[model samples]
Target: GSLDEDEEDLQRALALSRQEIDMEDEEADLRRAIQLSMQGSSRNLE
Candidate 1:
Protein backbone atom coordinates (compact mmCIF):
# COMPACT_ATOMS: atom_id res chain seq x y z
CA GLY A 1 0.00 0.00 0.00
CA SER A 2 2.82 2.37 0.66
CA LEU A 3 4.32 1.59 -2.72
CA ASP A 4 1.03 2.37 -4.42
CA GLU A 5 0.92 5.72 -2.72
CA ASP A 6 4.42 6.54 -3.91
CA GLU A 7 3.54 5.57 -7.48
CA GLU A 8 0.47 7.79 -7.45
CA ASP A 9 2.43 10.74 -6.10
CA LEU A 10 5.03 10.37 -8.86
CA GLN A 11 2.34 10.21 -11.51
CA ARG A 12 0.66 13.33 -10.21
CA ALA A 13 3.93 15.24 -10.18
CA LEU A 14 4.66 14.15 -13.73
CA ALA A 15 1.24 15.32 -14.90
CA LEU A 16 1.70 18.73 -13.28
CA SER A 17 5.12 19.20 -14.84
CA ARG A 18 3.78 18.28 -18.26
CA GLN A 19 1.04 20.86 -17.95
CA GLU A 20 3.57 23.50 -16.91
CA ILE A 21 5.76 22.64 -19.89
CA ASP A 22 2.79 22.96 -22.21
CA MET A 23 1.98 26.39 -20.80
CA GLU A 24 5.57 27.52 -21.20
CA ASP A 25 5.53 26.46 -24.82
CA GLU A 26 2.37 28.45 -25.48
CA GLU A 27 3.91 31.54 -23.85
CA ALA A 28 7.05 31.23 -25.97
CA ASP A 29 4.98 31.03 -29.13
CA LEU A 30 2.96 34.07 -28.14
CA ARG A 31 6.07 36.11 -27.40
CA ARG A 32 7.61 35.17 -30.72
CA ALA A 33 4.46 36.11 -32.61
CA ILE A 34 4.34 39.50 -30.90
CA GLN A 35 7.95 40.20 -31.73
CA LEU A 36 7.42 39.34 -35.35
CA SER A 37 4.40 41.60 -35.52
CA MET A 38 6.36 44.46 -33.99
CA GLN A 39 9.14 44.01 -36.51
CA GLY A 40 6.67 44.10 -39.36
CA SER A 41 5.11 47.27 -38.06
CA SER A 42 8.51 48.91 -37.71
CA ARG A 43 9.34 48.11 -41.31
CA ASN A 44 6.11 49.71 -42.48
CA LEU A 45 7.09 52.98 -40.78
CA GLU A 46 10.22 53.36 -42.93
Candidate 2:
Protein backbone atom coordinates (compact mmCIF):
# COMPACT_ATOMS: atom_id res chain seq x y z
CA GLY A 1 0.00 0.00 0.00
CA SER A 2 1.13 3.48 -0.76
CA LEU A 3 1.74 5.93 2.06
CA ASP A 4 -1.20 8.30 2.16
CA GLU A 5 0.88 10.79 4.13
CA ASP A 6 3.25 11.18 1.22
CA GLU A 7 0.40 12.12 -1.08
CA GLU A 8 -0.95 14.53 1.51
CA ASP A 9 2.46 16.08 1.91
CA LEU A 10 2.77 16.58 -1.82
CA GLN A 11 -0.71 18.06 -2.04
CA ARG A 12 0.04 20.55 0.74
CA ALA A 13 3.43 21.29 -0.76
CA LEU A 14 1.90 22.00 -4.16
CA ALA A 15 -0.72 24.26 -2.64
CA LEU A 16 1.87 26.22 -0.70
CA SER A 17 4.03 26.50 -3.80
CA ARG A 18 1.10 27.56 -5.97
CA GLN A 19 -0.77 29.89 -3.62
CA GLU A 20 2.34 31.86 -2.84
CA ILE A 21 4.48 33.05 -5.72
CA ASP A 22 7.39 33.19 -3.32
CA MET A 23 7.09 30.30 -0.93
CA GLU A 24 8.76 30.80 2.46
CA ASP A 25 8.90 27.20 3.54
CA GLU A 26 12.39 26.28 2.52
CA GLU A 27 12.01 22.65 3.53
CA ALA A 28 8.75 22.23 1.68
CA ASP A 29 10.15 23.99 -1.32
CA LEU A 30 13.08 21.63 -1.45
CA ARG A 31 10.82 18.65 -0.82
CA ARG A 32 8.55 19.73 -3.65
CA ALA A 33 11.53 20.11 -5.94
CA ILE A 34 12.62 16.61 -5.04
CA GLN A 35 9.08 15.41 -5.66
CA LEU A 36 9.16 16.98 -9.09
CA SER A 37 12.32 15.08 -9.86
CA MET A 38 10.82 11.78 -8.70
CA GLN A 39 7.45 12.41 -10.35
CA GLY A 40 8.86 13.77 -13.60
CA SER A 41 5.54 15.58 -14.01
CA SER A 42 5.69 19.31 -14.44
CA ARG A 43 1.94 19.54 -14.13
CA ASN A 44 2.00 17.78 -10.81
CA LEU A 45 4.59 20.21 -9.51
CA GLU A 46 2.43 23.10 -10.59
Candidate 3:
Protein backbone atom coordinates (compact mmCIF):
# COMPACT_ATOMS: atom_id res chain seq x y z
CA GLY A 1 0.00 0.00 0.00
CA SER A 2 2.65 2.49 -0.95
CA LEU A 3 0.17 4.85 -2.51
CA ASP A 4 -1.98 4.75 0.59
CA GLU A 5 0.96 5.53 2.86
CA ASP A 6 2.10 8.32 0.62
CA GLU A 7 -1.32 9.89 0.63
CA GLU A 8 -1.54 9.63 4.38
CA ASP A 9 1.87 11.17 4.84
CA LEU A 10 0.99 14.04 2.54
CA GLN A 11 -2.20 14.68 4.47
CA ARG A 12 -0.36 14.62 7.78
CA ALA A 13 2.27 17.02 6.51
CA LEU A 14 -0.38 19.40 5.24
CA ALA A 15 -2.14 19.40 8.61
CA LEU A 16 1.13 19.95 10.47
CA SER A 17 2.07 22.83 8.19
CA ARG A 18 -1.28 24.50 8.84
CA GLN A 19 -0.77 24.22 12.58
CA GLU A 20 2.77 25.57 12.34
CA ILE A 21 1.60 28.53 10.26
CA ASP A 22 -1.00 29.38 12.87
CA MET A 23 1.63 29.43 15.63
CA GLU A 24 3.89 31.56 13.44
CA ASP A 25 1.07 34.06 12.90
CA GLU A 26 0.52 34.33 16.66
CA GLU A 27 4.21 34.93 17.17
CA ALA A 28 4.18 37.67 14.55
CA ASP A 29 1.32 39.41 16.33
CA LEU A 30 3.21 39.40 19.60
CA ARG A 31 6.29 40.78 17.87
CA ARG A 32 4.27 43.65 16.41
CA ALA A 33 2.81 44.44 19.81
CA ILE A 34 6.25 44.51 21.40
CA GLN A 35 7.63 46.69 18.64
CA LEU A 36 4.82 49.17 19.10
CA SER A 37 5.40 49.28 22.84
CA MET A 38 9.07 50.19 22.31
CA GLN A 39 8.59 52.59 19.41
CA GLY A 40 9.49 56.26 19.84
CA SER A 41 7.40 59.20 18.61
CA SER A 42 8.60 59.02 15.06
CA ARG A 43 6.60 59.00 11.86
CA ASN A 44 7.28 56.86 8.81
CA LEU A 45 8.74 59.32 6.28
CA GLU A 46 8.14 56.95 3.42
Best by lDDT: 2
lDDT of 3: 0.55
- In terms of TM-score, which candidate is stronger, 1 or 2? 1
Candidate 2: which pairs clash?
Answer: none
Task: Report lDDT (CA) for all predictions.
Answer: 0.56, 0.66, 0.55
Displacement of the residue 40 alpha carbon in candidate 3, Å = 48
lDDT of 3 by residue, 1-46 (tens): 4887975776565556545555546666754544453453236646
Which residue runs does candidate 1 get wrong by more than 4 Å?
A: 23-46
Q: What TM-score do all the candidates reach, one by one?
A: 0.42, 0.38, 0.41
lDDT tens per residue, model 1, 1-46: 4887975776565555545555546666755544465454545665
Instruction: Please identify which of the two predictions, 1 or 3, would achieve the higher lDDT against the true structure.
Output: 1
Residues 1-46 of candidate 2: C-alpha lDDT, one tens digit per residue: 7887797887776666665645457766766676575565766544
